[PDB]
Coordinates of C-alpha atoms (C1' of nucleotides) and ligand atoms in Angstrom, one line a residue:
Chain A
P1 CA -15.8 8.7 -40.9
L2 CA -16.9 8.1 -37.3
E3 CA -20.2 9.7 -36.0
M4 CA -19.3 10.4 -32.4
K5 CA -22.0 11.0 -29.8
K6 CA -21.4 13.5 -27.0
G7 CA -22.3 13.5 -23.3
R8 CA -21.3 15.9 -20.5
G9 CA -17.7 14.7 -20.1
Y10 CA -17.0 12.7 -23.1
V11 CA -17.3 11.9 -26.8
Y12 CA -17.9 8.3 -27.7
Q13 CA -18.8 5.5 -30.1
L14 CA -19.4 2.3 -28.2
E15 CA -20.8 -1.0 -29.5
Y16 CA -20.7 -4.5 -28.1
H17 CA -21.6 -8.0 -29.4
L18 CA -23.1 -9.9 -26.5
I19 CA -23.9 -13.7 -26.9
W20 CA -25.3 -16.2 -24.3
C21 CA -26.7 -19.6 -24.4
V22 CA -29.7 -21.5 -23.0
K23 CA -29.0 -23.5 -19.8
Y24 CA -27.9 -27.1 -20.6
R25 CA -27.8 -26.0 -24.2
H26 CA -31.5 -27.0 -24.8
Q27 CA -32.9 -25.9 -28.2
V28 CA -36.1 -24.2 -26.8
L29 CA -35.9 -20.7 -28.5
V30 CA -38.3 -21.4 -31.4
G31 CA -41.6 -20.3 -32.8
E32 CA -43.6 -18.1 -30.4
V33 CA -41.0 -18.4 -27.6
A34 CA -38.3 -16.8 -29.8
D35 CA -40.8 -14.2 -31.0
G36 CA -41.8 -13.3 -27.5
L37 CA -38.1 -13.2 -26.4
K38 CA -37.3 -10.6 -29.1
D39 CA -40.1 -8.3 -27.8
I40 CA -38.9 -8.7 -24.2
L41 CA -35.2 -8.0 -25.0
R42 CA -36.2 -4.9 -27.0
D43 CA -38.2 -3.6 -24.0
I44 CA -35.4 -4.3 -21.5
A45 CA -32.9 -2.5 -23.7
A46 CA -35.0 0.6 -24.2
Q47 CA -35.5 0.8 -20.4
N48 CA -31.8 0.5 -19.7
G49 CA -30.7 3.1 -22.2
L50 CA -29.3 0.6 -24.7
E51 CA -29.8 0.7 -28.4
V52 CA -30.3 -2.7 -30.1
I53 CA -28.5 -2.6 -33.5
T54 CA -28.9 -6.3 -34.3
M55 CA -30.6 -9.2 -32.6
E56 CA -30.5 -12.9 -33.6
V57 CA -32.2 -15.6 -31.7
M58 CA -31.1 -19.2 -32.5
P59 CA -32.7 -22.2 -30.8
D60 CA -30.0 -22.4 -28.1
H61 CA -28.3 -19.0 -28.1
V62 CA -28.9 -15.3 -28.6
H63 CA -26.8 -12.6 -30.2
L64 CA -27.2 -8.9 -29.5
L65 CA -25.2 -6.0 -31.1
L66 CA -25.7 -3.0 -28.8
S67 CA -24.9 0.6 -28.7
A68 CA -24.2 2.1 -25.2
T69 CA -22.9 5.2 -23.4
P70 CA -19.8 5.2 -21.2
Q71 CA -22.0 5.0 -18.2
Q72 CA -23.5 1.6 -19.1
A73 CA -21.2 -1.0 -17.4
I74 CA -21.2 -4.4 -19.0
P75 CA -22.1 -6.5 -16.0
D76 CA -25.1 -4.3 -15.2
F77 CA -26.5 -4.4 -18.7
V78 CA -25.9 -8.1 -19.1
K79 CA -27.7 -8.8 -15.7
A80 CA -30.6 -6.5 -16.9
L81 CA -30.9 -8.4 -20.2
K82 CA -30.5 -11.9 -19.0
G83 CA -32.0 -11.8 -15.6
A84 CA -35.2 -9.9 -16.5
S85 CA -35.7 -11.9 -19.7
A86 CA -35.4 -15.2 -17.9
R87 CA -38.0 -14.1 -15.3
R88 CA -40.3 -12.7 -17.9
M89 CA -39.9 -15.6 -20.3
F90 CA -40.8 -18.3 -17.7
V91 CA -43.9 -16.2 -16.8
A92 CA -44.9 -15.7 -20.4
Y93 CA -44.2 -19.3 -21.7
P94 CA -44.8 -21.6 -18.7
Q95 CA -44.2 -24.5 -21.1
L96 CA -40.4 -23.8 -20.8
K97 CA -40.6 -25.3 -17.4
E98 CA -41.1 -28.8 -18.8
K99 CA -37.4 -28.9 -19.9
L100 CA -36.0 -26.3 -17.5
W101 CA -37.4 -26.9 -14.0
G102 CA -34.3 -25.8 -11.9
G103 CA -35.1 -22.1 -12.1
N104 CA -32.6 -21.2 -14.9
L105 CA -33.4 -20.3 -18.5
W106 CA -29.8 -19.2 -19.2
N107 CA -26.2 -20.6 -19.1
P108 CA -24.6 -18.5 -16.3
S109 CA -21.8 -17.3 -18.6
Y110 CA -21.8 -14.6 -21.2
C111 CA -19.5 -13.8 -24.1
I112 CA -18.8 -10.1 -24.9
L113 CA -16.7 -8.3 -27.5
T114 CA -16.1 -4.7 -28.3
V115 CA -17.0 -3.6 -31.9
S116 CA -15.6 -0.9 -34.1
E117 CA -16.3 0.3 -37.7
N118 CA -12.7 -0.1 -38.7
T119 CA -10.4 -2.9 -37.5
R120 CA -7.9 -2.7 -34.6
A121 CA -5.1 -3.2 -37.2
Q122 CA -6.4 -0.2 -39.3
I123 CA -6.6 1.9 -36.1
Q124 CA -3.0 1.1 -35.2
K125 CA -1.8 1.8 -38.8
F126 CA -3.6 5.2 -38.6
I127 CA -2.0 6.2 -35.2
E128 CA 1.4 5.0 -36.4
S129 CA 1.2 6.8 -39.7
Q130 CA 1.0 10.2 -37.8
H131 CA 4.1 12.5 -38.0
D132 CA 4.4 13.9 -34.5
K133 CA 4.8 10.8 -32.3
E134 CA 6.8 12.4 -29.5
Chain B
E1 CA -7.3 -15.9 -28.2
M2 CA -10.6 -15.0 -26.3
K3 CA -9.9 -14.3 -22.6
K4 CA -11.8 -16.1 -19.8
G5 CA -13.0 -15.1 -16.3
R6 CA -15.2 -16.8 -13.8
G7 CA -18.5 -16.0 -15.4
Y8 CA -17.6 -14.7 -18.9
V9 CA -15.5 -15.0 -22.1
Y10 CA -14.4 -11.8 -23.7
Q11 CA -12.3 -9.6 -26.0
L12 CA -12.6 -5.9 -25.0
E13 CA -10.4 -3.3 -26.7
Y14 CA -10.8 0.5 -26.6
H15 CA -9.2 3.4 -28.3
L16 CA -9.0 6.2 -25.6
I17 CA -7.9 9.8 -26.5
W18 CA -7.6 12.8 -24.3
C19 CA -5.9 16.3 -24.6
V20 CA -3.8 18.5 -22.5
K21 CA -5.7 21.3 -20.6
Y22 CA -5.9 24.6 -22.7
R23 CA -4.5 22.5 -25.5
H24 CA -0.9 23.4 -24.5
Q25 CA 1.8 21.6 -26.5
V26 CA 3.8 20.4 -23.5
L27 CA 4.0 16.6 -24.1
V28 CA 7.5 16.7 -25.7
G29 CA 11.0 15.4 -25.0
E30 CA 11.4 14.0 -21.5
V31 CA 7.9 14.9 -20.5
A32 CA 6.4 12.8 -23.2
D33 CA 8.6 9.8 -22.4
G34 CA 8.0 10.1 -18.6
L35 CA 4.3 10.1 -19.4
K36 CA 4.5 6.9 -21.4
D37 CA 6.3 5.2 -18.6
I38 CA 3.8 6.4 -16.0
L39 CA 0.8 5.3 -18.1
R40 CA 2.3 1.9 -18.7
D41 CA 2.9 1.5 -14.9
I42 CA -0.7 2.6 -14.0
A43 CA -2.1 0.2 -16.6
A44 CA -0.1 -2.8 -15.4
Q45 CA -1.0 -2.0 -11.7
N46 CA -4.8 -1.6 -12.6
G47 CA -5.1 -4.8 -14.7
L48 CA -5.3 -3.2 -18.1
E49 CA -3.2 -4.1 -21.1
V50 CA -1.6 -1.5 -23.4
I51 CA -1.8 -2.7 -27.0
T52 CA -0.4 0.6 -28.4
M53 CA 0.3 4.0 -27.1
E54 CA 1.4 7.2 -28.8
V55 CA 1.8 10.7 -27.5
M56 CA 1.5 14.0 -29.6
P57 CA 2.4 17.3 -28.1
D58 CA -1.2 18.1 -27.0
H59 CA -2.9 14.7 -26.8
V60 CA -2.5 11.0 -26.1
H61 CA -3.8 7.9 -27.9
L62 CA -4.0 4.6 -26.0
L63 CA -5.4 1.4 -27.4
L64 CA -6.0 -0.9 -24.4
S65 CA -7.6 -4.2 -23.5
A66 CA -9.7 -4.6 -20.2
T67 CA -12.0 -7.1 -18.5
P68 CA -15.8 -6.8 -18.3
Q69 CA -15.4 -5.6 -14.7
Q70 CA -13.5 -2.6 -15.6
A71 CA -15.9 0.2 -16.4
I72 CA -14.9 2.9 -18.7
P73 CA -15.2 5.9 -16.3
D74 CA -13.2 3.9 -13.8
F75 CA -10.2 3.1 -16.0
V76 CA -10.3 6.6 -17.6
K77 CA -10.2 8.1 -14.0
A78 CA -7.3 5.7 -13.1
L79 CA -5.2 6.7 -16.1
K80 CA -5.9 10.5 -16.3
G81 CA -6.1 11.3 -12.6
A82 CA -3.1 9.3 -11.5
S83 CA -1.0 10.3 -14.4
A84 CA -1.6 14.0 -13.8
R85 CA -0.7 13.7 -10.1
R86 CA 2.5 11.8 -10.9
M87 CA 3.5 14.0 -13.9
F88 CA 3.4 17.3 -11.9
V89 CA 5.5 15.6 -9.1
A90 CA 8.0 14.1 -11.7
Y91 CA 8.2 17.3 -13.9
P92 CA 7.7 20.4 -11.7
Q93 CA 8.4 22.5 -14.8
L94 CA 4.9 21.8 -16.0
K95 CA 3.6 24.2 -13.4
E96 CA 5.2 27.0 -15.5
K97 CA 2.1 27.0 -17.8
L98 CA -0.3 24.7 -15.9
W99 CA -0.6 26.3 -12.5
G100 CA -4.3 25.8 -12.0
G101 CA -4.2 22.2 -10.8
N102 CA -5.0 20.5 -14.1
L103 CA -2.8 18.7 -16.6
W104 CA -5.7 17.4 -18.6
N105 CA -8.8 18.6 -20.5
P106 CA -11.8 17.3 -18.4
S107 CA -13.3 15.4 -21.3
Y108 CA -12.2 12.1 -23.0
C109 CA -12.9 10.3 -26.2
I110 CA -13.5 6.6 -26.3
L111 CA -14.3 4.0 -29.0
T112 CA -14.8 0.3 -28.7
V113 CA -12.5 -1.6 -31.1
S114 CA -12.7 -5.1 -32.7
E115 CA -10.3 -7.2 -34.7
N116 CA -12.9 -7.5 -37.5
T117 CA -15.2 -4.8 -38.7
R118 CA -18.7 -4.1 -37.5
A119 CA -19.9 -4.7 -41.1
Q120 CA -18.2 -8.2 -41.1
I121 CA -19.5 -9.1 -37.7
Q122 CA -23.0 -7.9 -38.4
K123 CA -22.9 -9.9 -41.7
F124 CA -21.8 -13.2 -40.0
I125 CA -24.5 -12.6 -37.4
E126 CA -27.3 -13.0 -40.0
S127 CA -25.7 -15.8 -42.2
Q128 CA -26.1 -18.8 -39.8
Chain C
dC1 C1' -11.7 -37.6 -20.0
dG2 C1' -11.8 -34.0 -16.9
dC3 C1' -13.0 -29.9 -16.8
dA4 C1' -15.4 -25.1 -16.8
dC5 C1' -18.0 -20.6 -20.2
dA6 C1' -20.9 -24.3 -20.0
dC7 C1' -22.3 -29.0 -14.7
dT8 C1' -22.8 -28.8 -9.3
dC9 C1' -22.5 -26.7 -4.4
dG10 C1' -21.6 -22.1 -1.9
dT11 C1' -21.6 -16.5 -0.6
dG12 C1' -24.2 -11.3 -1.4
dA13 C1' -26.7 -7.5 -4.3
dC14 C1' -30.6 -6.3 -6.7
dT15 C1' -34.3 -6.7 -10.2
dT16 C1' -36.9 -10.0 -12.5
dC17 C1' -38.3 -10.1 -5.9
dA18 C1' -36.5 -14.6 -9.4
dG19 C1' -32.6 -15.4 -11.6
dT20 C1' -29.2 -12.9 -13.2
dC21 C1' -24.8 -10.2 -11.9
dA22 C1' -20.7 -10.5 -8.7
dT23 C1' -17.9 -14.6 -7.0
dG24 C1' -14.7 -19.7 -5.1
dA25 C1' -14.4 -24.3 -5.4
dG26 C1' -15.1 -29.4 -6.7
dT27 C1' -16.0 -32.4 -10.5
Chain D
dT1 C1' -30.8 -32.1 -17.0
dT2 C1' -24.2 -29.7 -20.0
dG3 C1' -20.6 -30.4 -24.1
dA4 C1' -20.3 -25.3 -27.2
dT5 C1' -21.7 -19.9 -29.2
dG6 C1' -18.5 -15.7 -30.0
Chain E
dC1 C1' -19.3 37.9 -27.3
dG2 C1' -21.7 32.7 -26.3
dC3 C1' -20.5 27.8 -27.0
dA4 C1' -18.9 23.3 -24.8
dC5 C1' -15.5 18.0 -25.4
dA6 C1' -12.6 21.9 -24.7
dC7 C1' -13.5 27.7 -20.5
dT8 C1' -15.5 28.7 -15.5
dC9 C1' -18.3 28.1 -11.2
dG10 C1' -21.1 24.4 -8.6
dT11 C1' -22.2 19.3 -6.3
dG12 C1' -20.1 14.3 -4.6
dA13 C1' -16.9 10.1 -5.0
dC14 C1' -12.4 8.4 -4.4
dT15 C1' -7.5 8.1 -5.5
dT16 C1' -3.5 10.5 -7.2
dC17 C1' -5.3 12.7 -0.9
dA18 C1' -4.7 15.8 -6.0
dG19 C1' -7.1 15.9 -9.8
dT20 C1' -9.6 12.8 -12.2
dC21 C1' -14.3 10.6 -12.6
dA22 C1' -19.5 11.5 -11.9
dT23 C1' -22.4 15.7 -12.9
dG24 C1' -25.7 20.9 -14.3
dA25 C1' -25.1 25.2 -15.4
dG26 C1' -23.5 30.0 -17.3
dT27 C1' -20.5 31.7 -20.5
Chain F
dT1 C1' -4.8 30.4 -19.4
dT2 C1' -9.3 27.1 -24.4
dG3 C1' -10.3 26.6 -29.8
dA4 C1' -9.8 20.8 -31.3
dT5 C1' -8.5 15.1 -30.8
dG6 C1' -11.1 10.8 -32.1
Ligands
LIG1 MG1 -12.6 -23.8 -11.8
LIG2 MG1 -23.8 23.4 -21.7

DNA sequence: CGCACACTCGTGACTTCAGTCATGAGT
DNA sequence: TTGATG
DNA sequence: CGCACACTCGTGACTTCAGTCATGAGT
DNA sequence: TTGATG
């Protein structure tokens, strides 16, 4: 019940739910802009060794569920996703500049949670149920 | 309940497991207890929180919480490397069967952990 | 209201060579 | 140009 | 024997200045 | 000095 992946010095199963918003909370991620964003984020992900498990684009925020290796640090992959998507989106959809002219597509904060198949409470119950704790 | 830092909001939990080198069953009695205390101290000194920790004779389970700035290889190095050094100094008797300079198996097992399941998260992510 | 994850100003790294990440501070 | 997603 | 997360040799980083992490390769 | 934890 776990499907572990293996690398040179480790066995792992790592997933994260990353969410960020549009700067000023403007509702600009619609129609073609949202569609182009999805293609851009997929591309950035593939080039940074991340696997996109789920992606949702709302008018003012984006959700990504990602699978990573132990070597992908969170700040590095968030900078790759948010910084390159902002540059690429303003170049691809110059109309974004009519509501965002200060050089930022994104809110400078990100939200990030680790994700597992079972819950933290089930994992604790499992460890505590073992007989040789000593 | 979500933690906050200068540029991020987060909830990062991991289940980390590693074994004794050669799979020797040496983590018992005073050795096991001394290890738990050493791992808790290393965690507190390196900004990690211990949610749960259990020690079996040949392996350790640790469920810990960290910030986005604490990369996995870095906190695994901090916990395994320093605990080995301290353990051999605190319990010289470990050298009886571990005389090669290693307390631990060089590999580690790590899983991200959430309070809700992936299936529930992934289902709430489409519903909006 | 008064912050702060979000707004603004500031520092440096590094890709996207712009606009994020790191980050302190005032509002 | 802000007011809240996880 | 040959495999590798586990065993061993190798390289470099960096703390714990020893013994992990990074890492490829032969068993 | 190894033989399997998630
Ligand atoms: Mg502040
Ligand atoms: Mg091999």
